[PDB]
Design an enzyme around this catalytic site. Structure first.
Site, mmCIF file in Angstrom:
data_model
loop_
_atom_site.group_PDB
_atom_site.id
_atom_site.type_symbol
_atom_site.label_atom_id
_atom_site.label_comp_id
_atom_site.label_asym_id
_atom_site.label_seq_id
_atom_site.Cartn_x
_atom_site.Cartn_y
_atom_site.Cartn_z
ATOM 1 N N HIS A 78 -11.465 -4.706 -17.560
ATOM 2 C CA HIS A 78 -11.027 -4.248 -16.253
ATOM 3 C C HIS A 78 -11.813 -2.994 -15.872
ATOM 4 C CE1 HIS A 78 -8.050 -1.576 -18.412
ATOM 5 N NE2 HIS A 78 -8.478 -0.771 -17.387
ATOM 6 N N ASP A 130 -8.636 -8.672 -22.129
ATOM 7 C CA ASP A 130 -9.146 -7.468 -21.492
ATOM 8 C C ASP A 130 -10.146 -6.798 -22.446
ATOM 9 O OD1 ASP A 130 -9.410 -5.466 -19.577
ATOM 10 O OD2 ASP A 130 -7.324 -4.719 -19.790
ATOM 11 N N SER A 226 -8.033 4.185 -19.881
ATOM 12 C CA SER A 226 -8.105 2.765 -20.225
ATOM 13 C C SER A 226 -9.482 2.382 -20.777
ATOM 14 C CB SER A 226 -7.584 1.846 -19.138
ATOM 15 O OG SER A 226 -8.332 1.950 -17.946
HETATM 16 C C1 LIG Z 1 -8.090 -1.311 -12.755
HETATM 17 C C2 LIG Z 1 -8.779 -0.092 -13.256
HETATM 18 C C3 LIG Z 1 -10.158 -0.046 -13.431
HETATM 19 C C4 LIG Z 1 -10.755 1.131 -13.896
HETATM 20 C C5 LIG Z 1 -10.037 2.298 -14.223
HETATM 21 C C6 LIG Z 1 -8.655 2.263 -14.041
HETATM 22 C C7 LIG Z 1 -8.069 1.066 -13.573
HETATM 23 C C8 LIG Z 1 -6.632 1.058 -13.341
HETATM 24 O O1 LIG Z 1 -6.332 1.617 -12.298
HETATM 25 N N1 LIG Z 1 -5.789 0.466 -14.244
HETATM 26 C C9 LIG Z 1 -6.202 0.193 -15.681
HETATM 27 C C10 LIG Z 1 -5.373 0.993 -16.720
HETATM 28 N N2 LIG Z 1 -3.942 1.085 -16.350
HETATM 29 C C11 LIG Z 1 -2.973 1.454 -17.307
HETATM 30 C C12 LIG Z 1 -3.208 1.195 -18.653
HETATM 31 C C13 LIG Z 1 -2.262 1.565 -19.609
HETATM 32 C C14 LIG Z 1 -1.059 2.183 -19.224
HETATM 33 C C15 LIG Z 1 -0.074 2.576 -20.141
HETATM 34 N N3 LIG Z 1 -0.263 2.358 -21.492
HETATM 35 N N4 LIG Z 1 1.080 3.177 -19.763
HETATM 36 N N5 LIG Z 1 1.301 3.414 -18.438
HETATM 37 C C16 LIG Z 1 0.360 3.052 -17.523
HETATM 38 C C17 LIG Z 1 -0.838 2.434 -17.853
HETATM 39 C C18 LIG Z 1 -1.790 2.080 -16.907
HETATM 40 C C19 LIG Z 1 -3.604 1.357 -14.910
HETATM 41 C C20 LIG Z 1 -4.370 0.510 -13.898
#
Ligand SMILES: Cc1ccccc1C(=O)N1CCN(c2ccc3c(N)nncc3c2)CC1
Length: 276
Positions: A78, A130, A226
């Site tokens: 992602h 992923d 991430s």
């Molecule tokens: C789509 C994208 C591409 C590039 C950079 C960031 C993103 C992005 O915005 N997302 C990817 C990561 N994500 C997570 C992962 C783990 C979480 C966790 N462990 N606990 N709470 C929330 C969490 C949220 C949020 C949405």
């Protein structure tokens, strides 16, 4: 004269695989940080890049990755899905613009074929597989601040169990900021997948390809973290770390999160690197 040698290899960062058996190759030592992380990202504490020398910083989307060998960075699909030429930094505790001027040049991005590609990222519900690899143009020189992490074996002592302790580290959201300025880290246990499913928020998909981790103290990784390595002690050496998980997605920051079960991808990882 050999690369990374005197024949002594440049230790502790390289090792030999020794007018001669051969009638010699110095290659990186994954997994062994120079100074181990000291506990005091949500629920984390201050980390030195030293503690996490595999940590890679992605800038354009704010994300992380793990260095796995001198030519390959490993990250969540992602994170590169829509950044095919990512900007990656290594070797630095601070991601402040001042301190941002060692950088890795990408050559090719390899997304896992089972990742579901989307034109618009927002409201992805399915984060299966992923995982993605990034081949660098030039080999990465290792030292105190830059070294690989080990990959899992396919052996069963690599199967994770509820309660297994790992590390997360990143410049993502903290209790104080939306993006950290300095590297942050936390120790957190592997949890049963029901714990993740029970955080109330088309339903999110949970597959066997996803580690749940978190627990009582509400440590978690968040947006910004991430693609970073959930680092686990090698089953047979406590001082060597391998990437059991990749920070994938999560119902709610500060609850329980989901990480790509790297073990399930080791064959693919291996094959991609050999065939390239
Ligand atoms: C789509 C994208 C591409 C590039 C950079 C960031 C993103 C992005 O915005 N997302 C990817 C990561 N994500 C997570 C992962 C783990 C979480 C966790 N462990 N606990 N709470 C929330 C969490 C949220 C949020 C949405």
């Amino acid at each position: 004269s050999i690369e990374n040698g005197k024949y002594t290899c440049e230790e502790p960062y390289y090792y030999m695989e020794g007018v001669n058996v051969l009638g010699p190759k110095c290659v990186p030592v994954c997994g062994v940080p120079r100074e181990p992380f000291e506990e005091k990202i949500i629920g984390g504490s201050d980390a030195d890049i030293k503690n996490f020398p595999w940590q890679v910083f992605f800038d354009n989307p704010w994300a992380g990755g793990a260095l796995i060998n001198e030519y390959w960075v490993l990250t969540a699909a992602h994170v590169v899905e829509g950044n095919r030429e990512p900007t990656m930094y290594v070797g630095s505790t601070s991601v402040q613009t001042s301190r941002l001027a060692k950088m890795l040049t990408p050559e090719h991005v390899f997304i896992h074929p089972g990742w579901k590609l989307l034109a618009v990222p927002e409201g992805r519900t399915n984060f299966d597989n992923d995982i993605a690899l990034v081949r660098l143009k030039d080999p990465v020189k290792m030292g105190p601040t830059v070294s690989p992490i080990c990959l899992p074996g396919t052996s069963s002592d690599y199967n994770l169990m509820d309660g297994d302790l790992g590390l997360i580290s990143g410049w993502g959201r903290t209790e104080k900021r939306d993006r950290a300025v300095r590297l942050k880290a936390a120790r957190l246990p592997v949890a049963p997948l029901r714990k993740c499913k029970e955080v109330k928020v088309e339903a999110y998909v949970f597959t066997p390809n996803m580690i749940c981790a978190g627990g009582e103290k509400g440590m978690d990784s968040c947006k910004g973290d991430s693609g970073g390595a959930f680092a686990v002690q090698d089953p047979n050496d406590k001082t060597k770390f391998y990437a059991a998980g990749l920070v994938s997605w999560g119902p709610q920051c500060g609850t329980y999160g989901l990480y790509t079960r790297v073990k399930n991808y080791v064959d693919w990882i291996m094959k991609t690197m050999q065939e390239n």
